[PDB]
């Protein structure tokens, strides 16, 4: 009864902090913001990093990434944003990765825990994602020792 | 001597004494009291709870 069409294993999502998204014919995997934090917010004027992997569902043609916009700031794409015939485009170097990059210049503050909308535009497909912030493989920040009360 | 009123107000809160079952450690003891979500470190004593 557990092996029918509605199966518990097969609809399971990746146990990662980034988000999946369908941009027309592009699969956006592990989309997340890298933004090390110190207080309740990361303030406007900080430059944070937007990371993802774009996978070409089609295997016949090629594709290219344009115009990532958001209402947290402006996104600069550096490098060759074309995703090949049946290949990937790694944008940013994630936490444990031992050069397309997406730089976000912030205009309003962001905080770890909330989701933020980003609009990806390919030459065939364009969608909004609601991206989280992921501290990656960074260690736990020290907490000041509490006194006796 | 065994009989006890369960609804006797005995617990200090931000709006007066209340009966035990209506309260918990999350009940504010004064208005604006800061109550942190603390996690158990597993070491008995020596800060068993941290922010």
């Amino acid at each position: 009864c557990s092996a029918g069409q509605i199966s518990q294993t097969t609809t399971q999502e990746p146990a990662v902090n980034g988000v999946n998204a369908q941009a027309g014919q592009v699969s956006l995997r592990n989309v997340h913001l890298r933004a090390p934090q110190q207080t309740d917010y990361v303030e406007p004027g900080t430059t944070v990093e937007l990371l993802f992997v774009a996978a070409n569902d089609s295997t016949e043609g090629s594709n290219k990434l344009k115009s990532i916009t958001s209402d947290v700031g402006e996104v600069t794409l550096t490098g060759d944003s074309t995703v090949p015939a049946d290949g990937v485009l790694i944008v940013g170097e994630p936490d444990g990765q031992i050069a397309v990059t997406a730089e976000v210049e912030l205009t309003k503050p962001i905080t770890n825990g909330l989701l933020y909308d980003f609009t990806f535009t390919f030459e065939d497909g364009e969608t909004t994602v609601a991206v989280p912030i992921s501290a990656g493989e960074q260690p736990r920040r020290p907490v000041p020792p509490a006194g006796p009360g | 001597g065994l009989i006890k009123n369960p609804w006797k107000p005995v617990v200090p809160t931000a709006e007066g004494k209340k009966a035990v079952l209506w309260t918990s450690g999350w009940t504010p003891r004064f208005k604006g009291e800061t109550i942190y979500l603390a996690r158990a470190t597993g070491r008995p004593g020596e800060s068993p709870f941290v922010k």
Binding site: D40, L114 | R29, F30, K31, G32, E33, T34
Partner: peptide
Amino acid sequence: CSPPGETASSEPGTTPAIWTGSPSP
């Protein structure tokens, strides 16, 4: 019976405000 004080809402809700915290324990 269903518990009368338990119903789904459709209102979205807002992001909670930053906690400041009053003094005087």
